[PDB]
Amino acid sequence: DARRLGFEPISTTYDMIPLSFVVGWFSNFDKYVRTLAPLIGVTFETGSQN
Amino acid sequence: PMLYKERRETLKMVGNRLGGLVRVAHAAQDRDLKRYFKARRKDRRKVAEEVANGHLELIFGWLPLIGELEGAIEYAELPDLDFIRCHGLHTLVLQSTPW
Amino acid sequence: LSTLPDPDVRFHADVGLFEISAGISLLAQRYLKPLQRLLKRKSFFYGRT
Numbered sequence: 001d002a003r004r005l006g007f008e009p010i011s012t013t014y015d016m017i018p019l020s021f022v023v024g025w026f027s028n029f030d031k032y033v034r035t036l037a038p039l040i041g042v043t044f045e046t047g048s049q050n
Numbered sequence: 051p052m053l054y055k056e057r058r059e060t061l062k063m064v065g066n067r068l069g070g071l072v073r074v075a076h077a078a079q080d081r082d083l084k085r086y087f088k089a090r091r092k093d094r095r096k097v098a099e100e101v102a103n104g105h106l107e108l109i110f111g112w113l114p115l116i117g118e119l120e121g122a123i124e125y126a127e128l129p130d131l132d133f134i135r136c137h138g139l140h141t142l143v144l145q146s147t148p149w
Numbered sequence: 150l151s152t153l154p155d156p157d158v159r160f161h162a163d164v165g166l167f168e169i170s171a172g173i174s175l176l177a178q179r180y181l182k183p184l185q186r187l188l189k190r191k192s193f194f195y196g197r198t
Contacts, residue, residue, distance in 0.1 A: 005120045009113055016195055018105030019188055022075050025116060029068060030173050042158055047150035051164040062169040069176050076184040102195045
């Protein structure tokens, strides 16, 4: 997933709860592992016959 | 699976520090808050402000760690690897004669 | 030799990725669920001061 902890330092007033971003980063990290999907690839380079 | 050893390591093993932040948080700014519940309204006007100020400082101090972790996570998304080679041979008897 | 035809490479896939999944799930139930439950009550706020 194109997210991996959005980060983005932002601060406001009367609308920013102290304990809120802590669990957010954990949830984002947990969801990032679910979207991970390895994708390998191979192609022919060169050969020979003796 | 043995090729993704170092990748999975640098991805998750070193990332334990990220989850470790929740431990200290729950141990400090959660269990020690019982004094606020048993406090009178006359003191809550200052207790809430002191808690908010203490939490904002911790958030500002731990914010660079999140950025560092996000920047280091990109290191595991570099398309780089070596190559693999194989071989094969076979024999077949043709003819023979004594001497 | 060159211009090799369409090969028939076979890969089993599904590497050892589910092992690390047990680590995050085990650490969350020990410190994430309790924190989320404790935060549900007496939710604090932040002002200008």
